[PDB]
Assembly symmetry: D2
Homo-oligomer: 458 residues x 4
């Protein structure tokens, strides 16, 4: 009977990947680290930092920890701290959802927030506020997980020994995502010390990070990647820092949760793809130990969602089935019925009336089609945009009281309404908007700004 849920931190199992690794290569075992009591793989270093700060006389019983964390180290820190009763005060950027902050609070912490993407160096971002809070309060100890060797020390004393004792020294490679220069450094130091030089320490990294050898970027795989060099990462330990993309990372995460029964996040997918790319230079008789550093239940809205993975350039395929089964004729509903509204302006109505019929229906293009009955055939006189009328009314090239039949652009290209969004996503690659002919009679206008809004939500 353990004395607290904080003693079960460690000894995480080591499962084997069956259906993801391609045939014709060695074994790839995946150290699953999301089974810790804190859910994450960073509660292994939180306990070590707490102990090294208590023993070395820096966190006097009664202090208040303070760390500008994101939401994955905060859980472990809060758990281990509230074991013995240390008030925990965090600092978070707005990029973190409400659910992660609710989790951080449910463990007995106090999470203050500062705006995200603000210049880190100023007193605006969370770094300056964290430093100020550390200075002011008494007893506060900012662990500074980025420049604290205790992280690598813990991953050296309790992660390296496990990966060795569980495989019996017959592990050739060790691929692990490198977010804060942690696991990689400690596990590499250990697996190189007590194995000679047989173990080659590979390291995964999001395509375009400092470690890979690139410049800054906005990141999506929360936890990995960086824009500078943490003082707790020996760049000499690793041997081949692979660089992986974000689409590949998310696809591998999804395929892993689908074919291996592991709900891992983004970093896990990136590490597994790096390994898979490392299982091609070493034939049989090899053993590559990936490290899955997180559990994929907080990402049920980011990756395993089907809209956020298409709000970007991701979503190679739908979560469980057919490619799209969605036609343009469905993009034009927004109410499941709301398309009895072909918005047209005959060739005689004054220009001001056309601009008004645009401003009223919140559209930005329309066919100037005679024969008012919206049942007409392809006999559309032309099209009148909005940015043109408003461009030919303020430059003097046309007056408000004029007839639209002298300031209308040629008709806009058309596509059938009963066709998937794929052909549209390619067709709007040459124009700005196109009509949707439904049985030969126009029924609406599909435009880029609408196509995105649909894809980005459904």
């Amino acid at each position: 009977i353990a004395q607290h849920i904080s003693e079960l931190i460690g000894g995480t199992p080591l499962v084997r990947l069956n259906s993801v690794v391609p045939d014709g290569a060695g074994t790839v075992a995946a150290k699953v680290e999301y089974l810790n009591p804190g859910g994450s793989s960073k509660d292994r270093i939180a306990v070590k930092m707490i102990e090294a700060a208590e023993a070395s006389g820096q966190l006097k019983p009664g202090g208040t920890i303070v760390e500008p964390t994101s939401g994955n180290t905060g859980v472990g820190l809060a758990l281990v701290a509230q074991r013995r009763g240390y008030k925990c005060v965090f600092v978070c950027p707005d990029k973190v959802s409400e659910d992660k902050r609710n989790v951080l609070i449910a463990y007995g912490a106090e999470v203050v927030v500062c705006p995200t993407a603000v210049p880190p160096h100023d007193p605006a971002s969370y770094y300056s506020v964290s430093d100020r809070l550390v200075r002011d309060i008494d007893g506060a100890w900012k662990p500074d997980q980025y420049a604290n060797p205790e992280g690598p020390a813990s991953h050296y004393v309790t992660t390296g020994p496990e990966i060795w004792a569980d495989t019996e020294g017959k592990v050739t490679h060790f691929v692990a995502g490198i977010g804060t220069g942690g696991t990689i450094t400690g596990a590499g130091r250990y697996l190189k010390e007590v194995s000679g030089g047989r173990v080659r320490i590979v390291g995964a990294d999001p395509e375009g990070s400092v470690y890979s050898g690139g410049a800054g970027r906005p990141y999506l795989v929360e936890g990995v990647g960086e824009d500078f060099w943490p003082a707790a990462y020996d760049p000499s330990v690793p041997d081949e820092i692979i660089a992986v993309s974000d689409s590949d990372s998310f696809d591998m995460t999804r395929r892993l949760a689908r074919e291996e029964a592991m709900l891992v996040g983004g970093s896990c997918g990136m590490a597994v793809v790096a390994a898979l790319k490392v299982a091609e230079e070493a034939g049989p008789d090899a053993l590559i130990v990936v490290l899955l550093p997180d559990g994929g239940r907080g990402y049920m809205s980011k990756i395993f969602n089907d809209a956020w993975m298409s709000s970007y350039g991701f979503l190679r395929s739908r979560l469980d089935g057919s490619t799209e089964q969605s036609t343009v004729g469905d993009v034009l509903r927004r109410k499941s019925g709301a398309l009895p509204a072909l918005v047209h302006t005959h060739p005689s109505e004054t220009v001001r009336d056309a601009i008004g019929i645009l401003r009223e229906y919140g559209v930005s293009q329309m066919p100037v089609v005679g024969a008012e009955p919206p049942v007409m055939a392809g006999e559309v006189a032309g099209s009148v945009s909005e940015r043109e009328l408003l461009s030919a009314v303020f430059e003097g090239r046309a007056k408000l009281a004029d007839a639209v039949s002298a300031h209308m652009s040629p008709p806009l290209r058309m596509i059938g309404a009963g066709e998937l969004v794929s052909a549209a996503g390619k067709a709007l690659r040459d124009w700005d908007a196109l009509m949707v002919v439904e049985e030969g009679k126009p029924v609406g206008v599909i435009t880029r700004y609408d196509l995105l809004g649909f894809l980005s939500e459904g």
Copy 2:
């Protein structure tokens, strides 16, 4: 004691314009004809037509008048017909106001509506429907005010003698707007028969009508102008057909009602402008008899309104006072306080994030600015449009997950907050939008589509 309201149709007074006509020219007397029971001058034609069709046995007692009436002759026809109980069935295009049809019905008629701007001879325009009604309903009689000699005959019998009788034959000119070829035809015939050849029949017309010598056009001054030749117009009666624009016509209407105490409509202002322009080529000793054919109380929302005039490029000046006194700082409210929302996108956010923040705030432009809190000075890194991103994202030049700092156009020019709308309307003549700087710190972006929206509604 008159035996019915429809007997006071005639003998309308003859007022003399005093403050409008410039000095140094003959007296410009304006036969003010909105004092008839029906309100306009067209009543004169109705009675004559009804009498002629009731004397020559073409409208048998119990018939049902039917005509595609413009709304002004409809009132006269309804009044005169309902004198004796002839059912009136008018056919009007949708371009007529609501109060106009309410006036037509309040007199006991029935008004059927048909679409406007459609081909005139199609099965949906009011001409064909009127012909169908005439054929089907027994006892029908389409007066056809456009090719009916009764019009000119009445304007000859009871509009000519009055002009020559209330002035003692001392009338040099007779200018009268020519819409259907009515008043001008008969009045000229008379004032030429019984005045020798001295009375030169001038005729006004909106610029761009068949009579003036132009082509088709969309008309705003209700009543005058045509796109064809009415069979009841002798083009040899007029001698000097002047042409007048619409802006000048409406300005003259408003100035006449402001300086002469006459709420005349649009054609009245056009006729007065034609007369004034004829009151310069003929020095003193001359007497010009204009004909004001309508009353300006139905136009109290069109020409005397301050939005319908500025929806177009009309509205030289406001009715009540100063020119505009409305600054851009006011153009940016839409709620009287609705600009605590400076919509920005920092240079690190993702392209998709910027597109979403454009689609969710109903805007189409926004400046990428660091230091999120909108209190910043002119140090805006740039401006990201909406059409670019949706064009740099579909062509392939950019990716949804790329940083916004690589697809942002240079900043957009800026203007002060307390500047009159005249300035902004000129300034947008070179760009498509511009910021509003208050003390130096931008607070919003004003765009053409918003400028015209503020003008045409306030």
Copy 3:
């Protein structure tokens, strides 16, 4: 050739009512006074007051007239004043539409506004502001049409003589709406002086006014009625002050414009109904001269409308045809299609879920019908309101986490969806809301609020 449109004020015709007066009574002639150059019958007194204040040395050329008028005397005052160029400044309550104020401005006046219904005696209503403006500016002359004998003097010198000279002293009665006395008092004094005592001066008045002998009210027939005794009204002149209702006034106005070809307002209808009620005590060989004091073009939105006359308890019949030809099944659209939304809460869903569904769908009652498919029969378990749940949740009689199956009221009565509103009103005359069964399956809930809101707009 008159010298100004202000000289045509007077000599208004005297038409006879043909189809309104019941058979078996004398002749009822209606002095039609909406043919004046100023539109109404108040421009006689405007001219007279201008003359008196200019000749009597109280309005020095260059002064600025100031009068807290409503919008009917303002037109005449503005016309007569701006004849010679007297700046006109008015004061109006908010009860006057935009069109009337635009008319007042189009003649060259300046109309300032103050809130309506505010205590007249305070410095808030338009009376105090008018008095202040009169005191401050120099040259201002507030005519005070309520305590200025010039009104009755003008209606005595130019209205009484006309009614006599046009009928040749063979006029028994003279009924005229009263709302200041200027009209009944003057014409009454004249027709009593130069006719002995044969002429009996009847006077109309809205049911429940001071003249009739009642107390205050909110009035709808603009112009008539009062809440005190003006100093320009001899209560002895009239003989029988009839009292007429507002429904009768508006109905008679509509029927008069429908059967006599006169577009008169409210006071005209009230005067005509008073006369018709006076044409029953005097047998044949009598002549009653009503006075129609206004023209019905500004009331095309109030009376001749079909919603404002149903917003109140008026509208005995539709403007031109069938009674309603509108079924309850149409009251439930609000979008022409928007009734696929039967909002139900099953007997097991928690009370909080029911309150939430109510708060979300903006309804205030709903059937708790099992068998989710909204195709069920009369098998509805019951009904749940909102004011009850919210009354049984704050008093302690029910807890949020409870089951609605123990706090639901008995089912609500039902009516078929294909039936006119009339029966709906008669039914809701006994309950608060009722279901609309459409083929035996409920399709919605029609409530008093909804039915009233619909009637008051369509």
Copy 4:
């Protein structure tokens, strides 16, 4: 190196509760179950069920599991089955969240949705559809976790021995939440067989379930309680079936996660409450082994949320700090500034006008106040509701065009602006609405509906 993740199902740790149990009682150790690969303790039965059905030749290789699963057993079944490639087709009621179905699909299953709250045995509930699927699709196998002996057999073979092995037979009590009856029946038979009769098998249950001795109810603690008797529950195994409410269950869940570092769900809190209430009737020298069967990360928006716990009579106190620190002056914003609209109706306006203002300002009650400008003091004449007018206008007691000062109820009581919501709730426990006085001048009306809506959203 494990051969598959589904092999790590078991051997879960045994933690000792320290800060929750009151002092003076035996040690209360809680077997924590959210450390399994599949999240909860519901994947112990999945492994045994799959093994038994694959050994006794009832799920032939290639079959397709089908079951109406609650979402927790679904995860375990999906993981274990997809170990070998058995297609899973789950049937869930709409009551389940979206992320839950996303978790089920992310594991390679297919989840069909069915309506909830409908009769359990009808053709629309998930039971009948699951039976249909089982019949039609060949190779189907409905595990029927509710009447399958495999559940208790597995909880007897691999959940009982662990309790007695990790404690060295020194276990006095074993309390475990009982729903479907699979853990008290399995972990009870063992601890009774191999401990004599000392181990009394206590059992928790939500107040109002069949087992506790009550009737049906709507449940909130997902997993426990029933409205019938599962065929896999031996009611003779338990000895003292405690019953616990829902408010207490959620409070204990939050307190356990705050003082013990465990994110357990609802049934975990219920079981802990039952244990604590059993840890009082047995003094020291006792050891109570609770069973926490779930992990509280899917409940991060249901029990740890501050609105869902306030949408009911739950939420004793907020997670982060002070009780409410939220005043009625804040309840009246809805936009953070949206009370510049004190909606009034002066005592002279018409009843119809008051109804119209109530309908157009989205309110349902308003104080009739003279001196319109909302700056007035307590001198309000009264208050007018909207149910009265819509009842005093349909019954006939009032006329729709009558003055509002004759159908207005007396004023409604008032409260300050800066008062805590709880005070407002207790006040509204007596009336249906009340004003908010700021400095003495009323500024708005707070009603039961608005208060309970502000609670359930903030």
